[PDB]
Design a protein around this ligand. Structure first.
Ligand SMILES: CCCCCCCCO[C@@H]1O[C@H](CO)[C@@H](O)[C@H](O)[C@H]1O
Length: 329
């Protein structure tokens, strides 16, 4: 058990292994810090109201279990996790420590116009991390430029687990989402890397859906066939019957292989969207693809997801997970 010290940043207290120094707010609350032990800049995150309700307590546990399991180059991982509390009885606060990646993809696209080679590599690393996430049977569900950290070498990590990058079926609360909701996201992000502009900058919920329909067109008979509801099913007919656009004509001048990949991500029907593993074999990534260096995750026990427990059950399990934590090499 290390030594802790106390300090107030903005309007909140932090107690941290003394090895963590120069705490400075960045936006639970987050602080950048220097890891005196390893010599590297870190992010330390203090979980808001970890055990306030049953839902929060389950979310805390989910969050830790998830991040504990993420061991991949293109996915954020845990350097450390600590509480100031000795014993479960005292246990009330949880801190997570990860790499301070010092620029995100939004920051990169605003300033620099990226080449074809840049977008192959960036999207390639997204799909690579994504293949690993999906192979644990997890859906990210919030991929966007600000959830993607990028260094000087234009190397990328997925952060996470606005609506411009959200699959239309989440916006319609369709339920049982499949993993290709993240693929939709990747398609929006890639369109934006290619053009420098947000593909679907909706002002609100319906606007979002409006701009989507103008690009990819109103649902095809094959898709309408799958819409359980007389409800949803009409209104659609009643809409200005839009043509699916030619992506060739929208992303004019882009690599035609990139344009083909985009048609395969930005399909309305989630059943027809390319998967992360299939996209990695797409000819667009021929320069970067290596079928032996695109690993999948260990099996992720998420049976907890289906259980309804008492707050103290959730916290104790969270405590076990703090105690069980082994740092990476
Ligand atoms: C905005 C107009 C309608 C949007 C159509 C979105 C269709 C998304 O695709 C749907 O994904 C579901 C998973 O949610 C699958 O069960 C369906 O089989 C599939 O068609």
């Amino acid at each position: 058990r290390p030594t802790f010290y106390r300090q107030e940043l903005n309007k909140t207290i932090w107690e941290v292994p003394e090895r963590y120094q120069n705490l400075s707010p960045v936006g639970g609350s987050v602080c950048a810090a220097f890891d005196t032990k390893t010599g590297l800049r870190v992010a330390v995150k203090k979980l808001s109201r970890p055990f306030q309700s049953i839902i929060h307590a389950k979310r805390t546990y989910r969050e830790l279990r998830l991040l504990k399991h993420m061991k991949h180059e293109n996915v954020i991982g845990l350097l450390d996790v600590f509480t100031p509390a000795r014993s479960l009885e005292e246990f009330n606060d949880v801190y997570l420590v990860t790499h301070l990646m010092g620029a995100d993809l939004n920051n990169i696209v605003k300033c620099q116009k990226l080449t074809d080679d840049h977008v192959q590599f960036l999207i390639y690393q997204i799909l690579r991390g994504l293949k690993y996430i999906h192979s644990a049977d997890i859906i990210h569900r919030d991929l966007k430029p600000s959830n993607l950290a990028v260094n000087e070498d234009c190397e990328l990590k997925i952060l996470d687990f606005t609506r411009w990058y959200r699959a239309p079926e989440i916006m319609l609360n369709w339920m049982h989402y499949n993993q290709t909701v993240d693929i939709w996201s990747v398609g929006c992000i890639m369109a934006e890397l290619l053009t420098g502009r947000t593909l679907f900058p909706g002002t609100d919920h319906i606007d979002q859906l409006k701009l989507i329909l103008r690009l990819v067109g109103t649902p095809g008979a094959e898709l309408l066939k799958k819409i359980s509801s007389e409800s949803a099913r009409n209104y659609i007919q009643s809409l200005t019957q839009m043509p699916k656009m030619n992506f060739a004509n929208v992303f004019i001048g882009a690599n035609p292989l990139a344009v083909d990949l985009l048609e395969k991500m930005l399909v309305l029907d989630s059943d027809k969207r390319i998967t992360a593993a299939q996209a990695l074999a797409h000819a667009y990534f021929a320069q970067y693809h290596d079928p032996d260096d695109e690993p999948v995750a260990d099996p992720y026990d998420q049976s907890f997801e289906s259980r309804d427990l008492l707050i103290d059950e959730w916290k104790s399990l969270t405590y076990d997970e703090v105690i069980s934590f082994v740092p990476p090499p």
